[PDB]
Amino acid sequence: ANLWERFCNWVTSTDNRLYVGWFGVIMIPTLLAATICFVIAFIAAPPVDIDGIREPVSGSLLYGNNIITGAVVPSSNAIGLHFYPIWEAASLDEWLYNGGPYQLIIFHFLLGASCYMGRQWELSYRLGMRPWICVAYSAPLASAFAVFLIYPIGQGSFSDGMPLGISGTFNFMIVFQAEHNILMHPFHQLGVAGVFGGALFCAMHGSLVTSSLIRETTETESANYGYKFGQEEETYNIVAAHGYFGRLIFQYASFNNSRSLHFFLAAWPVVGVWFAALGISTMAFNLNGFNFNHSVIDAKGNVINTWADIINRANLGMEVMHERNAHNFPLDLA
Amino acid sequence: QKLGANVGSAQGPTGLGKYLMRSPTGEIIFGGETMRFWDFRGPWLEPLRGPNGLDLNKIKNDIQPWQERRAAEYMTHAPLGSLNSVGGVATEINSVNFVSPRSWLATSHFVLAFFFLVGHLWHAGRARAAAAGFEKGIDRESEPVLSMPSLD
Amino acid sequence: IFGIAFSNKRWLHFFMLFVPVTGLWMSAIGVVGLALNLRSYDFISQEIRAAEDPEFETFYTKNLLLNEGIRAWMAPQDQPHENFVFPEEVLPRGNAL
Amino acid sequence: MEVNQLGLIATALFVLVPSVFLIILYVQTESQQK
């Protein structure tokens, strides 16, 4: 074999401890760049003028943050959607002031994570598996796209991208609520059903399989030793688990087909999270949550508040206080 | 400016121009948060634009009533609104029945493009597996991983 | 793909119980503290610095400003038994909005 | 920054005490007969 052939054989090899693959050829460098920049920035980056108003926000540990307050801060509103690579700055000091690390990190990450998804397809193919794990990963991936790319596009700035940090994340959430009433949007509601339900069904599946494990061990050892990696025989009694669950509710509400069960376990969280992602991606173009502000009126025309109006008061609080020096005109239009 | 403001020289709270400032390459642009939108171009605004951006003499002397009308119209039909078609910001009261066609068209087509990407992945992955002969599962008697060396 | 993997099916399915069950139980402990207003509201070190240094800003300080808005703007209607009257002039607001 | 001056020792022992516990149990497991 020639060099290219040998190289291709290595890249696509099923015997590498970690699969590389063609997706991996892009994933590995982009993820390493994003990671290294993030780590250094999170530790040592100076303050960043997120809102383009010469009001720099400190995100790094060395500049007075802890793990909870810290962040890599979004690029400046002055930049908007412009591409701000290192080489468009006059110096690294300028690059840093303007939030250049954010763009480098999110662009390398989104490319790398997209290739992580491709790589899941690729290895499934090399190993003779069915191909759709990558489709389940499209749900968190789409969500990362929504908050780091689609929302900025809609609003016209990477300054409105989710910050890379814990408190930064909460800031993004509170301002999103003020601006889009996300809680009242059915796609975020589906998202909640997706993750609360994913958690519920996770606990339920775990508990039911654990309930029905076949006795293979004694009281002074972990029941886990009753299963051996690669054994042919199933390790729990699905008939007993179904016998249980079908009586807990009623018979036809319980799955007696493992394939159907495991498909439901995939589909419920994945579909819900796809709607979560689509919620963010469509509120990106300001189709917002349901607005029932003053929807209930009495015979005279007096407003009779509902819980929607109370939400509205909270939202107003968020709206009027956020980015307190950035607005000069009465309406926040993006 | 009708009230007497000198809009080129008016310093906002942050030190940036309240009405007018510079883009990162120096072009004169509107200030406030709309600094992000300085790449916008439109026929009602372009007559005010000079070689270096928004021109202060054109601003002071050449703004026509049709431009005022158009800007007022567009400011008050911004593409923001609720799912039940209450126009305006999320905290606005019921009154105006409006969601921009631009919001309807962009959101619908995002949703559809997204699910079409998902369908691309679903069908491309399936096409591959079917072509190679393992779309229905792993052959118990010829499980490929069982013929591969262990990773460790 | 990821570097590690399950090898033991009993462990796997136990872990599926443990994770969400433990999470919920932790959230409950926090709410028990909130019953008493025993919050994680502040980082004292942050507040000392910010009080002394008007140029020091983090996402933590930004969120508290949002919180102050929420409280002032929602309290009068959300807590009617307090008969709050907050004159326009006391309401916390940023520029313009 | 004016941090709590017991945060360092609190954090160090929070890590070291249970980590030590686990390392002791692991190593004595390995040294048992195969």
């Binding site: 401890r17 540990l61 802890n66 | 990773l151 | 590690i4 993997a5 | -």
Partner: peptide
């Protein structure tokens, strides 16, 4: 001291990832 402590914990986590991956107990079939 605070910064050192955060970075130290993170770096221990990263080392752990390395050992958990490359020096795992290898899975063995029966």
């Amino acid at each position: 001291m605070e910064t050192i402590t955060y970075v130290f914990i993170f770096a221990c986590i990263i080392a752990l990832f390395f050992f958990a991956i490359f020096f795992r107990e290898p899975p063995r079939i029966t």
